[model samples]
Target: LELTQSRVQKIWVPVDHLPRSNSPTVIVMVGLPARGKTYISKKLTRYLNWIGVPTKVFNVGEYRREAVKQYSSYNFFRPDNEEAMKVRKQCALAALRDVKSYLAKEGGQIAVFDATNTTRERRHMILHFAKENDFKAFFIESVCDDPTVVASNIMEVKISSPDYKDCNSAEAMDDFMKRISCYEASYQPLDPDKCDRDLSLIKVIDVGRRFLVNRVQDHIQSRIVYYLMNIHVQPRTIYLCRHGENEHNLQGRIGGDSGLSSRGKKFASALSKFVEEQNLKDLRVWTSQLKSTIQTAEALRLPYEQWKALNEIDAGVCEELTYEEIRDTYPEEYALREQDKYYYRYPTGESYQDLVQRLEPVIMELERQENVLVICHQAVLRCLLAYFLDKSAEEMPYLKCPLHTVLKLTPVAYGCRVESIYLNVESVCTHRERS
Candidate 1:
């Protein structure tokens, strides 16, 4: 519980909340297909979870795919398609169950529901579920009237979607447009006058060029609204690189302030060469305040900043100690860390869970930037990659981020597409067992 020195007291107000539960929020996505609904949902999920706000994304599309295994062509989305309607309802309800279950537990705080949700009836079901579960249902509606954005979305889904698996590119495009036409025919926009008095809402038009909201109160909802206000989702690439290998690499240590090694020096120049080839004239580079990361980005003659948040996860009492050393001296502590790698804080150090909160502001700024190169530590880079790549908690701590590689992440409508490039250098066994 904190307060800001604000001059506008009218903007602050209280609203309904859950009983005997954590601040569990359900973000119900509303928009036609290809309006960047999933992207927004993913980002919301990532940002919330990064801030130590328990969050998960419940994608109705994923649930739908599980129910229908075969050709779910554009025709299936037809208004009169009874079976498709049944399956859609089933998928929504099933996902709703998952959302309900998540809120039932203490760790589960927020769930972002990603789907078209273009109809009042469908949204009604969502509201009913919320009422029964005693949770807040917030609608995040995207209205994209830009033809250019729509065209790009068409290109992304046509070939990328599973429904177009065996179809030719030309045919896929035609089929997708047909599906869009079906939705456009009966698209029901959320009318404020008709909406339930208690429902909270946000409507972004043309990616925030114009927007409106209703009944938006409280800290979490306000932060999300502010974050969305600054977001401009143009096609762009985000490049990530672990700081070049250093003496810490050779010593097999955790958390050190050492300078780059000979191999690290070579990779730095190689990375400079890689940046030159990319020719991203408007690129922005970011690095940790630590020496190794800043030194690693020295070769790039681009606008760069050093962020303290990008520094490696603190090891505290275990600083600079090898895994073997920790295991030998503090066996019980090491075992406890292994049991819950995410929440187990180091002795007077940060936990992955704690680090998540520290990284929230960075993640917020990250979602608002365009064409950035994040040069940081292995653990820090993994945290960035996990959000873009949607890695599990079990997979995130052990993700293999070899030296001399630049991971390029491109944000498209469906999700983030990633490509890893090696800078033609030898590697070290930096990957550790799950802990």
Candidate 2:
């Protein structure tokens, strides 16, 4: 059915009310990597099932892994290989036909396709199949601007899947850098008109529309609860604070695990006062095992845990050297990082992208905990902030994690609300001085 403004606002099918007779229904998920497509699909599946609708998820990757038996390598751009492209096309078509047939017989059944259907042509094929079977088709697109998260997701796969390898080398990373540098380069936006073959049978849900609805719902529900219960639900706030100003920071050094300076110590004390005033007694504290973060957190006097993953960006072989030193000594290594910081593993150190994968467990834990205060370095903070802020790949390197600032992030219904508290400490020379 054509989606009217009103109908689109409250479009939902109750699982129990769904027709028992076979009537085809299709839900198409389209998005780029690390845009939360898989995440949304899982949540949608649960919600649909909770309402009594049976649904099946057809993941392109899973199909490739299981049905196609193409385990060693899978790249969408390399579809130039006729055999590989044919197999992929066949798999996608088979999935669509199977879902259509099942829904036609079972009526009210929902089929969810989880894939990076980035092109209009792919979506058209799915929509055409749905129309032939007289099924309603809905398109859900998930979008995120953060490149760091995307790069992190890629790095995570590499770590988990030992067989996975990057096709690009150090030289290729430089080319990628040049490509991304151009301001005019932009990802193609979805055009609903091109795929609206039958106006009466298709519905498209854009990110802005979905976000707006979710925002309004959250506001209404929160207000109602606050008014009726006379209770304020202190949202779980996570404060990710970078270590105090260090020698490296002042000198514009690239990679040095130097301790915080005198002013850094003063900043630490001020931060402590801020935390105490906020009565963050219940807040769990986390810091990297590095001297900088450890020293900064000393004044807090709270129960704390040290994690290696929270350490600063690994500088590879030059883990503790200045940029000038790196340029003078290991110029090639420095160039390599400049090219692809996302995947470049330090000679003996870790990359920012590697740090992201390492922080996965921490992220999982943080998702379940409340009021966590993270004290770490710049690169580590960038990786963590990128996860919540939805930063782009190009912006990750330059994300500002200024020293002596305590950032509080409240994860609201629609998105995270952030606030900063700067510690204006006077004249302590070193972070160790505070301790």
Candidate 3:
């Protein structure tokens, strides 16, 4: 018991937790079709999970599709269609059941209920369900009346849906517009002065052009609001690349303020040419404060900001030592690290866990901006990649992020699409795998 207690204590001391509430949260999405509700649900889920909170999107539409083999048209979604209404209600309840199980049995801290819970009656029912199950319910209502925004959303995502399998793009769009009309009949926006004033809620106006937040009760809800407010759907790309290979890297040593080597300089010049070819618009460049990263960005000859948080993982006593030296000199310390590298802190240094905590601000800012190219260190880039790619903790530290490679990430429907472009300049392989 003593050994286990100390072990747990050691692992958690340096970490800063985002969600402190013991009770799980049910994030019920409220919006009409094409109001960007699913987009917000998915992006928020990704952000929450990246910050170590277990989250999943319980899309009720998928449940409805599973229940009904085929969808004929928007007529089925008409408010007067009692037969179809029953199926939709059942699907919502079924999704709620799964949410309960996920939070209670499967250790999920947050469950995003993605659906058009547009009526006061429906939201009240969900709120009561959350209360009875001892879960906090936070409503996020996306309200956008702009025709062009709604039309664009349908064109972007609705026409490509499986429900429109045999339908052509023109017919599919017309049918989806009719579908929105069906919901428009009964869609009730959350009004703070009315029945929802006491509830925790956020009204995302016109795809995050503005937000009305009410009764933010806890750290998680506030964080969610902050995240939603900062994120915009206007398309953008993020470029992540490790700094040019440094002298210490060529020497097989870890974590030192070393200048770029001769070959590293070659790679930097190649990267500059590559950037110019892409001709990215209004690109913001960022680098770590370290000499190696600064030297790398210097080749770009572009204005760049430096972040201290983007510095490499401090190896402590093993800072300047090669892997072989550590394995021979401190065999037991090396052995412990091999057992659980994610949590293993070097004598006085940081773990992958610590590195993640330090990079949280960087990740948040990255989400807020549009086009950015970050030149940082190996572990720092790994943490950033883990956020963008949704890699698990165990997989993040071992993700093969080699030198002279740029990873371009663009946001897709619910995830990011990554394109790995390796600059032609050959550099030494720095990837290390488990034995």
Best by lDDT: 3
Residue 299 deviation, candidate 2, in Å?
0.2
Can you write out model 1's per-residue Cα lDDT over 68-187, one digit (the tens) per residue?
Answer: 877657898898999888988889889988888888765598889998889888888888888788788899999987778887877865567787788888887778778888889778
The 0-to-1 C-alpha lDDT of every candidate, in the order given, reads 0.81, 0.62, 0.88
* Residue 154 of model 3, lDDT score: 92
Candidate 2 lDDT by residue in tens digits, 315-336: 6567666667877997766666
Each candidate: how many clashes? 0, 21, 0
Question: For residues 79-121, could you state the per-residue lDDT of candidate 3 as single tens digits?
Answer: 8999999999999999999999999899999999999998889
Model 1: runs farther than 4 Å from truth?
Answer: 1-23, 54-69, 72-75, 80-98, 105-107, 193-198, 425-428
Model 3 residue 85 lDDT score: 94
Winner by TM-score:
3
Instruction: Give the distance in Å from residue 123's predicted Cα in candidate 1 to where it truly belongs.
Output: 3.3
Candidate 2 or 1, higher TM-score: 1
Q: Which stretches of candidate 2 lie over 4 Å from their true place?
A: 1-234, 250-257, 426-435
